[PDB]
Amino acid sequence: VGAXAXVXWXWXWXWX
Amino acid sequence: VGAXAXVXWXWXWXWX
Ligand SMILES: [Cl-]
Numbered sequence: 001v002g003a004x005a006x007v008x009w010x011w012x013w014x015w016x
Numbered sequence: 017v018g019a020x021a022x023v024x025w026x027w028x029w030x031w032x
Pocket residue numbers: 003004005006032
């Protein structure tokens with residue numbers, strides 16, 4: 001759990 | 017639903 005790539009908050013694909 | 021900021025898959029904070 002922390003910063004980098006995966007799922008959660010930030011930039012990428014999903015919901016706005 | 018699509019690409020940009022918010023929640024889902026990509027770069028920022030959460031689980032990797
Ligand atoms: Cl990562």
